[PDB]
Amino acid sequence: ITLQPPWVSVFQEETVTLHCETQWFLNGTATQTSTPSYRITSASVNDSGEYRCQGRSDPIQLEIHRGWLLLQVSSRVFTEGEPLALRCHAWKDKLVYNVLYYRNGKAFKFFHWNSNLTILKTNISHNGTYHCSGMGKHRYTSAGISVTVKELFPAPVLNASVTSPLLEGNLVTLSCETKLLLLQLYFSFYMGSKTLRGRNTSSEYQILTARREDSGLYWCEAATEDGNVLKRSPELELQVLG
Amino acid sequence: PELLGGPSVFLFPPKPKDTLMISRTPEVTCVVVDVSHEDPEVKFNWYVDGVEVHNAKTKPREEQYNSTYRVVSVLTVLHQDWLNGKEYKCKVSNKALPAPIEKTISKAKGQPREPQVYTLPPSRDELTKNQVSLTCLVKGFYPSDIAVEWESNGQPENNYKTTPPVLDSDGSFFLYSKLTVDKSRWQQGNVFSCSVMHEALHNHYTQKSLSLSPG
Amino acid sequence: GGPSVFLFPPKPKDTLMISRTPEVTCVVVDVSHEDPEVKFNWYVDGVEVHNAKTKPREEQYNSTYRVVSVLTVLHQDWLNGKEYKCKVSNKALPAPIEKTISKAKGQPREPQVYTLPPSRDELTKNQVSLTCLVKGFYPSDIAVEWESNGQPENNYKTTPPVLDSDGSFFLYSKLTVDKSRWQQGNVFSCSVMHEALHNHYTQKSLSLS
Ligand SMILES: *[C@@H]1O[C@H](CO[C@H]2O[C@@H](C)[C@@H](O)[C@@H](O)[C@@H]2O)[C@@H](O[C@@H]2O[C@H](CO)[C@@H](O[C@@H]3O[C@H](CO[C@H]4O[C@H](CO)[C@@H](O)[C@H](O)[C@@H]4O[C@@H]4O[C@H](CO)[C@@H](O)[C@H](O)[C@H]4NC(C)=O)[C@@H](O)[C@H](O[C@H]4O[C@H](CO)[C@@H](O)[C@H](O)[C@@H]4O[C@@H]4O[C@H](CO)[C@@H](O)[C@H](O)[C@H]4NC(C)=O)[C@@H]3O)[C@H](O)[C@H]2NC(C)=O)[C@H](O)[C@H]1NC(C)=O
Ligand SMILES: *[C@@H]1O[C@H](CO[C@H]2O[C@@H](C)[C@@H](O)[C@@H](O)[C@@H]2O)[C@@H](O[C@@H]2O[C@H](CO)[C@@H](O[C@@H]3O[C@H](CO[C@H]4O[C@H](CO)[C@@H](O)[C@H](O)[C@@H]4O[C@@H]4O[C@H](CO)[C@@H](O)[C@H](O)[C@H]4NC(C)=O)[C@@H](O)[C@H](O[C@H]4O[C@H](CO)[C@@H](O)[C@H](O)[C@@H]4O[C@@H]4O[C@H](CO)[C@@H](O)[C@H](O)[C@H]4NC(C)=O)[C@@H]3O)[C@H](O)[C@H]2NC(C)=O)[C@H](O)[C@H]1NC(C)=O
Ligand SMILES: *[C@@H]1O[C@H](CO)[C@@H](O[C@@H]2O[C@H](CO)[C@@H](O)[C@H](O[C@H]3O[C@H](CO)[C@@H](O)[C@H](O)[C@@H]3O)[C@H]2NC(C)=O)[C@H](O)[C@H]1NC(C)=O
Ligand SMILES: *[C@@H]1O[C@H](CO)[C@@H](O[C@H]2O[C@H](CO)[C@@H](O)[C@H](O)[C@H]2NC(C)=O)[C@H](O)[C@H]1NC(C)=O
Ligand SMILES: *[C@@H]1O[C@H](CO)[C@@H](O[C@H]2O[C@H](CO)[C@@H](O)[C@H](O)[C@@H]2O)[C@H](O)[C@H]1NC(C)=O
Ligand SMILES: *[C@@H]1O[C@H](CO)[C@@H](O)[C@H](O)[C@H]1NC(C)=O
Ligand SMILES: *[C@@H]1O[C@H](CO)[C@@H](O)[C@H](O)[C@H]1NC(C)=O
Ligand SMILES: [Zn+2]
Ligand SMILES: [Zn+2]
Ligand SMILES: [Zn+2]
């Protein structure tokens, strides 16, 4: 399911349409509409609920509201790396100015003229409750909404298999260590700013016979296939003695 | 291009004096302003501790200097209900509002405290003027709702002014009332009285006198 | 979008004591991070002056900025009724915003000041009230304090000015003190500062008997 107006939160009496990518399931029961598009011409309080369509689609929770201002988001649950579109929407599309966007009770952005806001690559710091406010004939404030941004994988740690003062001619394995939290990850190993081994599904890299000149600072990067989550490890100090 | 916004509502308590004399009729007043030409009609619902009552009196819309309407509704409240802390809720509906507006009002909360009432005669240095000031100090009282007046010989005195209540450091209130009188009347021995009405007096009324002593 | 401007008078006490430095304060709020410098021009009875001290923008908790400009005013200028105009210019404003301020106008009148002892009836309590009546003053700007034996007394409260029936203002000030301290004969004094007193001040004493 997709939405014209993207927003999962809409005012009473506004139009929104759902396209299915047929049968429509609202709150777990079937409705008439056979169309591949569901038309709410004038939203009412009974249009709030969980929507599904035809195997079968994930749920979408649609909220109909009343108020002066309504903070609109495109969904309520994100993975790290995804974009979050926000809008401070005035009832009957009237004018507000000097608008503020809030995260967890802290204003984080101010526009002289009402404007929507898109956080292009989200992450755990974006997780929280958002509201907006704005000046019309009086200062008006929206209800808060919950947004969720879930960590895909923590930042990797480079781990070596022998501790740092180590001897010539040893085997040592470096491991780029990170746990996915539900596609697989791609790893690359480095020494100073130089590349040791490039993008690969293997999370390990061997120095077969360590020599003195392998002494340096080693780190790694773990990236999703498409790469819109890419994270690096801190540097580990590794020494080979003669 | 039109700025967002509709009417506003202010909900006013009764006058202290109306709440304190059982022969008077205290009222709560719900006032709506910025009612537009576009959406003129306004509706009131009233609740006493959450129960709808129906005996409110609604006056007709009056157009103000700024081309918006003002609409007032008055609910009479029972003496004992007000003093016993019942909550009066005014609900205002109008098409320019996204949702009805609800305002609630009740007596201020906290343990009531008895006013201490002291009369102070005029300063010696004032007694060269043609008129003198008779002072009534009222302190230690809670809540701030109070009424003060002056009498002499059964008749009320009109030439007085009273400060508003002022928060003292112990969380109670005080005020002063000043009655101006011809010095001749003070000199002749006339008895003047400062009368105070407050919830925490017995019968909500006390009276203290003041006169130049004889002999 | 619209910064807003607020123009504040000096503290009455700063205007009535020649030792102090009274100031007018022009505050501009809702300036955005993007907005360029907020510019201030200041006028005294319509003549520009260049001795205003304008502060750097300061980010507020709501992520907007606030900018203050302070102009010292001279003792006789303020009391003679001169007008101070703050003019705020910025790209975020289509037209500059102007605000003017001066001393409240009307013929000054000198307060009379009277100290009243505590009532006999109050002398059963652990603390008693000493009263200072200040009446017949105009304009309403005023400061009242209490002292004893050379040091401020802190436990007092003063009503606001109230319009009397002749167009002048009055107020009362209440000093609360331990009963013992009153009966032991200590001298207290009520000090009033107001434009129309000679040198803008007077002091009246109060003690037992
Ligand atoms: C178009 O025209 C309308 C009429 O214009 C008037 O304005 C002047 C300039 C002149 O033109 C006159 O000819 C016109 O009458 C405008 O209507 C006015 O709108 C403003 C708001 O914009 C109202 O302001 C509120 O006023 C109350 C106090 O009002 C009483 O006292 C007034 C004198 O100060 C008096 O004029 C009023 O009639 C009213 O009188 C009382 O009436 C009752 C009932 O009859 C009597 O029983 C009383 O005894 C009597 N009192 C007296 C004295 O006579 C004030 O309380 C409001 O302040 C609250 O809200 C503010 C938000 O705006 C806030 O800033 C304040 O801090 C305060 O906040 C409250 O704080 C308390 C804590 O104590 C909380 O409990 C509250 O929750 C909290 N509320 C908050 C934060 O919101 C406010 O100042 C004004 O009353 C109104 N006039 C009339 C008349 O109806 C209109 O605005 C204008 N519109 C436009 C777009 O131009
Ligand atoms: C982002 O934050 C900014 C501030 O930080 C805030 O932090 C948060 C956490 C919270 O604590 C806030 O409270 C903090 O302020 C916001 O800035 C504020 O913005 C509002 C308006 O948008 C300003 O409101 C005005 O306030 C003045 C009174 O200001 C004094 O007193 C305040 C406390 O009561 C105090 O906080 C102020 O700092 C200021 O203090 C004075 O400061 C000076 C010098 O700096 C000293 O010399 C003084 O001693 C000192 N006094 C004290 C006490 O400390 C108020 O007067 C304004 O009201 C008039 O104008 C209104 C128009 O907006 C109107 O609605 C009112 O009815 C009133 O109208 C006037 O009526 C009289 C007649 O009665 C006429 O004489 C006037 O002509 C008429 N006005 C006209 C015609 O214009 C107004 O309420 C607020 O001051 C400002 N705070 C600071 C600090 O700068 C900012 O808003 C916020 N932005 C957003 C988008 O959220
Ligand atoms: C599908 O289910 C949703 C809820 O998940 C239904 O929405 C609710 O149903 C009715 C609308 O007629 C409302 O009772 C309810 O809103 C109530 O909530 C407030 C307090 O929160 C209460 O004070 C009101 O009186 C009001 O009754 C609706 N909204 C929500 C979020 O619960 C919806 O109707 C269902 N639709 C169908 C077709 O089954
Ligand atoms: C992430 O954000 C969520 C949602 O903002 C936070 O959860 C709050 O989540 C719920 C929805 O409002 C409420 O049930 C809770 O009051 C509160 N969460 C808990 C666990 O009590 C959550 O705190 C955030 N957590 C992290 C780790 O980022
Ligand atoms: C999540 O992403 C945000 C936004 O991209 C990161 O914020 C940094 O970027 C801003 C510019 O927008 C810059 O001022 C600072 O470098 C911010 O820290 C943020 O780092 C990132 N947070 C986490 C926990 O990964
Ligand atoms: C929604 O349905 C229920 C009754 O089944 C009721 O709340 C109301 O009549 C309906 N409201 C609308 C706008 O259809
Ligand atoms: C809101 O602003 C964004 C960023 O400028 C832009 O892509 C778009 O026109 C607007 N989005 C919606 C959903 O209206
Ligand atoms: Zn890199
Ligand atoms: Zn009793
Ligand atoms: Zn001088």
Numbering used by the authors:
A (entry chain A): 24 to 44, 54 to 86, 91 to 218, 223 to 282
B (entry chain E): 232 to 446
C (entry chain J): 236 to 444
From the paper:
The crystals had C2 symmetry, with unit-cell parameters a = 134.7, b = 126.8, c = 71.8 Å, β = 118.4°, and diffracted to 2.4 Å resolution. The final refined model contains 5311 protein atoms, 321 carbohydrate atoms, three zinc ions (present in the crystallization solution) and 156 solvent molecules. The interface between Fc and FcγRI covers ∼1160 Å2 and involves both chains of Fc. FcγRI D2 was found to be solely responsible for the interaction with Fc, since no contacts within a distance cutoff up to 5 Å involving D1 and D3 were seen. In particular, the interface between FcγRI and Fc chain E constitutes a major interaction area. The pocket is made of the hydrophobic amino acids Leu105, Trp106, Ala126, Trp127 and Val132 in FcγRI. No carbohydrate–carbohydrate or protein–carbohydrate inter­actions between Fc and FcγRI were observed.
The family of IgG Fc gamma receptors (FcγRs) play a crucial role in controlling the immune response in mammals. FcγRI, also known as CD64, is the only high-affinity (nanomolar range) receptor and the only one whose extracellular domain (ECD) comprises three individual subdomains (D1, D2 and D3). FcγRI binds IgG1 best, approximately tenfold better than IgG3 and IgG4, and does not bind significantly to IgG2. Mutational studies have previously attributed the high binding affinity of IgG for FcγRI to the second and third subdomains of the receptor.
